[PDB]
Structures are given as structure tokens and as C-alpha cells.
């Protein structure tokens, strides 16, 4: 059943992918080069279905952080 959980957490988190893709571009200049890479790696990650729930929890924290560092509030 916790696979039906992972599937549902993933469907929900994907709502933030436009904001991650937008950050990577709108801050292309003031971002590290490897920071651009990982934001890209994270957006790809969210295309797959075989993500573990612990990975999903980290992404949840990663996305809270981005929302707070860029265009906050």
C-alpha cells in the first residue's frame, strides 16, 4: 500500500515543477553551475515513478527551501 502512498505524494509534489524549472532559468546568472545541474536532475527525478518515499521527503524539504530563498512569501 505504501506504493499507493508514494504514487500519491509524487503526483502532488509535481505541482511545484514549473516553479523549479522557472527558478533554474530566472536565476541562471546568480546560480552556481552545479546548482543549475541539480535543479535539472531534480526535475527529471520527478518524471519517474520508482522514487522512494525517503527521497520524496527530502524533495519536500528541498522545495520548501527554494520557495523561501527565491521570490519568497
Amino acid at each position: 500500500s505504501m506504493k499507493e502512498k508514494v504514487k500519491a505524494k509524487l503526483v502532488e509534489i509535481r505541482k511545484f515543477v514549473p516553479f523549479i524549472r522557472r527558478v533554474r532559468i530566472d536565476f541562471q546568472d546568480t546560480l552556481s553551475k552545479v546548482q543549475g545541474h541539480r535543479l535539472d536532475a531534480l526535475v527529471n527525478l520527478l518524471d519517474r515513478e520508482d522514487v522512494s518515499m525517503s527521497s520524496l521527503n527530502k524533495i519536500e524539504v528541498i522545495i520548501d527551501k527554494l520557495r523561501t530563498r527565491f521570490n519568497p512569501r
Partner: peptide, 23 residues
């Protein structure tokens, strides 16, 4: 093998976790 894949995802995410994105 799923350990190798799970590990690659986690190492990558640990690198975004640790980055404060100091702005």
C-alpha cells in the same frame, strides 16, 4: 539492482539538502 539507483537519487538530493542557496 535497486540499491545502486536508490543510492544515486539520495546522494543527489543530499547535495540539494546541504546547499543553503545562500542568496
Amino acid at each position: 539492482e535497486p540499491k545502486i539507483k536508490e543510492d544515486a537519487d539520495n546522494a543527489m538530493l543530499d547535495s540539494l539538502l546541504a546547499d543553503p542557496f545562500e542568496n
